[PDB]
Design a protein around this ligand. Structure first.
Ligand SMILES: *[C@@H]1O[C@H](CO)[C@@H](O[C@@H]2O[C@H](CO)[C@@H](O[C@@H]3O[C@H](CO[C@H]4O[C@H](CO)[C@@H](O)[C@H](O)[C@@H]4O)[C@@H](O)[C@H](O)[C@@H]3O[C@@H]3OC[C@@H](O)[C@H](O)[C@H]3O)[C@H](O)[C@H]2NC(C)=O)[C@H](O[C@H]2O[C@@H](C)[C@H](O)[C@H](O)[C@H]2O)[C@H]1NC(C)=O
Length: 249
């Protein structure tokens, strides 16, 4: 699986974890050089596992849906906790033999957020903060869980979607930070960005609809071409065509 052990980790081993994780994902072909992810995949290949150990050697294994980089479930020791409203497949092929519990919330930011009474703009990301969520996830408790899960997906799934986010957490290695407004907006927008870069093949570069983002400082701008600085060296994983278009952005 894609390994990352916090007990040996530096800004270097963290980018390599992300770099490796970006490259066990199957994609069908690079759209504007951003790998585009399969809408449909033989369930044998559906899920990839990330192998996360903390400073103090708590190993949890978390499952990623390659079809959309979502985290679907996670195993601690030999209990295995699934999001409410997972893939059915996930339940069959994954963590066989473990008592399998279904967390009371779906895995999406606005649920997670509720269960946590705490929007992620108030939750310290960072490499120390990762290695803590792993401790509060290993030793599961329904109070602790949901905010620990907020930390886990942003420092891994969104890091692999957006190099802006990968870079930020590579910066904070012996300290934590907070989502700046730009990291949030990339987060809330990977999908509309995927839908429009997909469309923007047909009209030779330009978006069909514009995508609205916010600078760290609070300045609302918009990107509207695959030329723009966000598309151009930032985005690294494209949302599967079916998922990205069903929703109007
Ligand atoms: C999921 O991720 C886990 C975390 O990395 C993997 O488990 C760990 O695997 C590593 C290496 O792959 C392994 O590390 C060794 O730890 C030992 C240190 O402890 C001993 O120290 C002295 C030595 O004489 C003894 O006197 C003490 O009493 C301790 O017992 C030692 O064998 C090695 O030196 C390794 O550590 C070094 O660390 C610094 C690096 O620079 C070096 O490259 C490296 O050699 C641990 O067993 C384990 N760690 C923890 C905290 O859990 C896991 O894969 C493993 O699974 C086990 C079954 C297998 O035997 C291997 O260890 C490895 O495959 C990984 N994969 C999966 C599928 O979950």
């Amino acid at each position: 699986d894609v390994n990352f052990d916090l007990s040996t980790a530096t800004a270097k081993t963290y980018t390599k974890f992300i770099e490796d994780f970006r490259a066990t994902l199957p994609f069908s072909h690079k759209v504007y050089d951003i790998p585009l992810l399969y809408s449909t995949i033989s369930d044998s290949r559906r899920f990839i596992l990330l192998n996360l150990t903390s400073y103090a050697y708590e190993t949890i294994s978390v499952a990623i849906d390659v079809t959309n980089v979502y985290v679907v479930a996670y195993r601690t020791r030999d209990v295995s906790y699934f999001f409410k409203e997972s893939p059915p497949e996930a339940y069959n092929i994954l963590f066989k033999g473990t008592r399998k519990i279904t967390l009371p919330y779906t895995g999406n930011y606005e649920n997670l957020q509720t269960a946590a009474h705490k929007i992620r703009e108030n939750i310290d990301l960072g490499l120390p903060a990762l290695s803590s969520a792993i401790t509060t996830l290993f030793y599961y408790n329904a109070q602790s869980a949901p905010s620990a899960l907020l930390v886990l997906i942003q420092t891994t799934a969104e890091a692999a979607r957006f190099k802006y986010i990968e870079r930020h957490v590579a910066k904070y290695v012996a300290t934590n930070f907070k989502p700046n407004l730009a990291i949030i907006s990339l987060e809330n927008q990977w999908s509309a960005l995927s839908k429009q870069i997909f469309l923007a093949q047909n009209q030779g570069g330009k978006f069909r609809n514009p995508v609205d983002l916010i600078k760290p400082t609070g300045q609302r701008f918009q990107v509207t071409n695959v030329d723009s600085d966000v598309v151009k060296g930032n985005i690294k994983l494209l949302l599967n065509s079916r998922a990205s278009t069903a929703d109007e952005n």
